[PDB]
Amino acid sequence: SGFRKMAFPSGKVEGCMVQVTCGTTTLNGLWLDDVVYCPRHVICTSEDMLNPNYEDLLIRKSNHNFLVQAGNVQLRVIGHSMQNCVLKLKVDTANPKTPKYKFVRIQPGQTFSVLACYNGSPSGVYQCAMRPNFTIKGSFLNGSCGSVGFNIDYDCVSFCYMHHMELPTGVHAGTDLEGNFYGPFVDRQTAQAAGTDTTITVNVLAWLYAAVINGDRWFLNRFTTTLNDFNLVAMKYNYEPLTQDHVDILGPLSAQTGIAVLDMCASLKELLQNGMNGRTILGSALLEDEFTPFDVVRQCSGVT
Amino acid sequence: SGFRKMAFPSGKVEGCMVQVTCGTTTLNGLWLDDVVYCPRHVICTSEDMLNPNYEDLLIRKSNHNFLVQAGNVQLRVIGHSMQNCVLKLKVDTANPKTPKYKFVRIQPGQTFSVLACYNGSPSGVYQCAMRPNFTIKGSFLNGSCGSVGFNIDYDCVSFCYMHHMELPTGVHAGTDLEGNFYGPFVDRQTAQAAGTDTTITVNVLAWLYAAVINGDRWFLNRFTTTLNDFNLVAMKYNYEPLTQDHVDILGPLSAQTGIAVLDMCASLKELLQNGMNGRTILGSALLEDEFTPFDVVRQCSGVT
Numbered sequence: 380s381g382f383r384k385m386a387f388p389s390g391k392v393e394g395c396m397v398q399v400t401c402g403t404t405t406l407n408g409l410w411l412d413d414v415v416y417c418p419r420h421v422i423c424t425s426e427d428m429l430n431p432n433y434e435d436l437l438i439r440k441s442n443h444n445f446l447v448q449a450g451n452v453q454l455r456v457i458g459h460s461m462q463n464c465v466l467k468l469k470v471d472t473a474n475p476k477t478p479k480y481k482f483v484r485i486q487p488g489q490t491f492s493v494l495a496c497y498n499g500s501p502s503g504v505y506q507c508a509m510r511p512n513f514t515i516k517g518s519f520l521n522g523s524c525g526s527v528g529f530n531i532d533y534d535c536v537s538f539c540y541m542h543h544m545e546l547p548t549g550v551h552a553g554t555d556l557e558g559n560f561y562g563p564f565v566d567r568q569t570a571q572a573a574g575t576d577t578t579i580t581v582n583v584l585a586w587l588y589a590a591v592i593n594g595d596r597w598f599l600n601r602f603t604t605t606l607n608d609f610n611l612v613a614m615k616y617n618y619e620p621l622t623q624d625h626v627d628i629l630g631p632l633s634a635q636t637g638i639a640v641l642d643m644c645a646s647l648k649e650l651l652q653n654g655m656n657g658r659t660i661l662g663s664a665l666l667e668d669e670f671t672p673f674d675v676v677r678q679c680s681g682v683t
Numbered sequence: 684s685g686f687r688k689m690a691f692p693s694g695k696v697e698g699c700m701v702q703v704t705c706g707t708t709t710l711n712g713l714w715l716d717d718v719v720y721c722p723r724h725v726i727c728t729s730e731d732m733l734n735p736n737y738e739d740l741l742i743r744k745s746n747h748n749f750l751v752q753a754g755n756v757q758l759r760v761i762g763h764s765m766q767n768c769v770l771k772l773k774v775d776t777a778n779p780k781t782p783k784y785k786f787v788r789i790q791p792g793q794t795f796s797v798l799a800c801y802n803g804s805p806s807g808v809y810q811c812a813m814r815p816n817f818t819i820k821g822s823f824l825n826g827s828c829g830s831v832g833f834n835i836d837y838d839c840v841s842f843c844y845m846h847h848m849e850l851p852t853g854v855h856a857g858t859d860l861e862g863n864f865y866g867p868f869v870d871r872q873t874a875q876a877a878g879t880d881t882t883i884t885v886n887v888l889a890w891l892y893a894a895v896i897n898g899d900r901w902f903l904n905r906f907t908t909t910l911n912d913f914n915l916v917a918m919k920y921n922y923e924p925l926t927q928d929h930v931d932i933l934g935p936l937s938a939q940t941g942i943a944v945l946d947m948c949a950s951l952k953e954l955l956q957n958g959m960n961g962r963t964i965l966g967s968a969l970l971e972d973e974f975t976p977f978d979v980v981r982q983c984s985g986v987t
């Protein structure tokens with residue numbers, strides 16, 4: 380028993396982190412096979428970052444300007460290209476620690492582990508979700524750019540995030556590993572406001588299922604609702620609309636607990652309308668929305 | 684910016700996890716040099732666990748009864764001994780992935796990373812604290828015993844916990860790596876109630892400092908207090924008494940923010956007396972107490 384915000388073991392990703400320096404800018408790179416992936420703003424002088432022309436800036440850069448260090452050993456750069464907002468640095472040596480991997484572009488509501496790094500050195504690991512406004516609520520200081528987000532399916536690391544930007548509101552923006560920003564964000568020091576941070580309804584319901592499985596049941600009530608009725612309450616509280624797809628995804632948790640999805644919707648409705656009344660659920664005083672149905676099933680069944 | 688419950692990178696510990704089987708009981712072991720550490724209850728049949736005599740049970744066990752598997756390769760057991768509540772299995776091969784390590788016995792309030800494992804395979808990593816009642820609030824199912832808690836100081840892993848027990852209240856009890864239980868707990872299926880789970884006052888204050896550093900300041904007030912006055916409020920709310928030692932430990936965070944420790948004590952006092960009034964601090968609706976002053980400084984300054 381017990382339910383914790385759990386990151387994937389970070390070992391497979393630790394073995395991929397390198398330091399990239401171009402000029403004075405030092406940040407992190409991801410070394411997979413003979414390619415080092417890093418944010419393209421590594422070529423910027425913070426002055427550039429006001430309105431950088433990346434193609435023009437890159438013209439002034441040679442293979443030998445990209446200083447790539449894996450632990451205490453330098454990698455030889457034999458090629459460089461720009462793909463969207465990342466640089467791909469071809470090195471003469473395949474990373475011998477390259478795990479089985481994929482690049483996936485995640486959807487909002489999907490969760491992932493971040494390995495926060497500085498100078499290509501891992502400092503910590505935490506669990507995030509891609510917010511409905513395509514920001515993440517991370518922990519990133521200067522030097523952390525090029526830190527990656529990932530899921531592991533047994534032996535296969537799916538990389539879904541590279542850290543690029545902090546917004547003046549202290550939330551985080553980044554790319555998938557093809558260098559396309561999540562959401563409308565750009566690698567430029569400009570006025571970029573996040574949209575509404577809506578709550579991931581299906582994740583809240585998953586975590587309510589986790590709570591029941593783990594003994595926290597005080598919030599279960601005698602009520603049910605409909606998708607359309609529940610969704611009027613969701614709209615009012617800046618929750619994502621709940622779809623039949625979400626209901627279907629919660630099927631396994633429904634089955635295991637014997638609580639119909641719409642009954643748990645009715646529990647969530649009363650919690651939204653009535654608040655927690657100073658009580659907690661799985662040690663939280665708010666409704667947690669950074670566990671997916673898949674995360675709950677994984678943790679509650681002990682998959683490795 | 685941003686402040687997250689952050690685990691240490693788990694790679695160095697992943698390389699130490701093995702599977703230990705004695706009879707039908709499978710759980711995890713920690714392979715350091717040529718020794719495998721695991722809970723002694725691995726020799727029990729759950730029936731035994733009602734009132735096991737471990738010395739007597741162990742007499743019936745030989746080196747060849749301890750099946751030790753590191754990934755898909757079997758380790759040869761050439762010795763076994765009992766130290767307190769752990770077994771030490773001598774194997775004929777030093778773990779080639781053995782990191783620099785220490786065994787430390789932590790104090791209540793101190794935090795650490797758990798690498799939850801099943802069949803010697805890492806499933807996830809999360810941050811814990813040793814509670815003032817010597818329990819931890821973990822996420823552990825059957826097969827997770829022998830999972831370890833740890834801190835990393837650069838290259839040195841300090842192992843502080845091995846998982847042994849869940850209490851009927853769904854909290855967790857375990858040993859340091861010399862096999863001595865934290866608190867009064869015993870590896871026996873009996874009536875074992877946790878004491879008061881008091882809040883780690885110094886950790887709450889550290890996290891209030893983290894909040895101010897990261898932009899969350901609404902809770903700062905025009906008040907100060909004294910240690911003795913604050914402590915009357917702590918007693919009333921089942922908070923640990925705050926000592927001059929705690930004040931001194933918070934010195935660096937005090938310095939950096941320019942908020943005197945006793946002023947922040949006065950902020951915490953009003954929060955205890957008045958509640959959050961439906962507001963949040965660093966995305967929490969309650970006062971977080973599983974960040975040490977050392978954790979806050981580490982995360983806020985980007986140590987690797």
Ligand SMILES: *CC(=O)N1CCN(S(=O)(=O)c2ccc(Cl)cc2)CC1
Nearest residue numbers: 403404405406425521522523524543
């Ligand atoms: C995003 C990231 O981690 N980095 C981009 C900014 N650089 S930097 O070298 O321009 C720099 C800016 C500000 C400070 Cl305080 C220090 C460095 C660092 C890498």
Ligand SMILES: *CC(=O)N1CCN(S(=O)(=O)c2ccc(Cl)cc2)CC1
Nearest residue numbers: 707708709710729825826827828847
């Ligand atoms: C603590 C731990 O992880 N383990 C001790 C109990 N054993 S077991 O083999 O006795 C066992 C008990 C109950 C179930 Cl459902 C399955 C196994 C497992 C390891």
